[PDB]
Design a protein around this ligand. Structure first.
Ligand SMILES: *C(=O)N1C[C@H](NOS(=O)(=O)O)CC[C@H]1C(=O)NC1CCNCC1
Length: 268
């Protein structure tokens, strides 16, 4: 049921000047679209969705966790901390940091939550616990964005991203209340309007998390999409490119998402 219908991903990535990796799963039939799906690509900010899921998993055993107030200093506010910079003088709860990390890609929030989990290895351990043997987080914000060709640090594959996203949003890896909270955070993302969402009809529900490393044409998005009248679709689109100064493209990600939906025979 993989690649029943071929799609022109090679031409797409050639025009982009790099590599595109796609995995998309129709959760009704199990049909998939797959292109470079087992190659590694940098996560960039996209690890933050899985980070929030890991925090939610912890919260299943710690009923006070989400409402715990976290204080932080000015040193925590690295580049791109749009929410947490507004609450420097007050603190934020763990849930608020989680929402900020997911929905605004907030970097300080992500580092504070990583600390709660025992760092990159702690998040990696959570991913292992749900059966993801591919994912690895190695570094913190901002160092994890280096996106060096061939470097496996801070990478996963489109396939493992999709598989893990499915388990967490639709499967049983989270308890039901936490599952819905994760979905709701993804649905409220603000940074993805020009990526997978651009390929998804406005009358379908969709949650996503983006990433943009800032070098080597490296950027990404993953999403869970609920078309009306049929089962949900899970998909991941990752890019990279050979040269440090190669620029990412949001349009290329949207285009790849369109091809994936077309390959699944989902009318969009
Ligand atoms: C994540 O990859 N980020 C955080 C933020 N938005 O995330 S995104 O997925 O919407 O792109 C901005 C870019 C990126 C990030 O952390 N970039 C670093 C800081 C800015 N200098 C380049 C590396």
């Amino acid at each position: 049921l993989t690649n029943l219908v071929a799609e022109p991903f090679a031409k797409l990535e050639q025009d982009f000047g790099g590599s595109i990796g796609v995995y998309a799963m129709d959760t009704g039939s199990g049909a998939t679209v797959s292109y470079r799906a087992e190659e590694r690509f940098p996560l960039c900010s996209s690890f933050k969705g899985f980070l929030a899921a890991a925090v939610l998993a912890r919260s299943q055993q710690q009923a006070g966790l989400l409402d715990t107030p976290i204080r932080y200093g000015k040193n925590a506010l690295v580049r791109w901390s749009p929410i947490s910079e507004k609450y420097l003088t007050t603190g934020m709860t763990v849930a608020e940091l989680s929402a900020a990390a997911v929905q605004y890609s907030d970097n300080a929030a992500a580092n504070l939550l990583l600390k709660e989990l025992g760092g990159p290895a702690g998040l990696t351990a959570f991913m292992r616990s749900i059966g993801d043997t591919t994912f690895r987080l190695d570094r913190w914000e901002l160092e994890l964005n280096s996106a060096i060709p061939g470097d496996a640090r801070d990478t996963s594959s489109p396939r493992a991203v999709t598989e893990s996203l499915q388990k967490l949003t639709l499967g049983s890896a989270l308890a039901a209340p936490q599952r819905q909270q994760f979905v709701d955070w993804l649905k409220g993302n603000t940074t993805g309007n020009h990526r997978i969402r651009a390929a998804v009809p406005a009358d379908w529900a969709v949650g996503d998390k983006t990433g943009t490393c800032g070098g080597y044409g490296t950027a990404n998005d993953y999403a869970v999409v609920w078309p009306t009248g049929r089962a949900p679709i899970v998909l991941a689109v990752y890019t990279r490119a050979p040269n440090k100064d190669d620029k990412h493209s949001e349009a290329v990600i949207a285009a790849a998402a369109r091809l994936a939906l077309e390959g699944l025979g989902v009318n969009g």
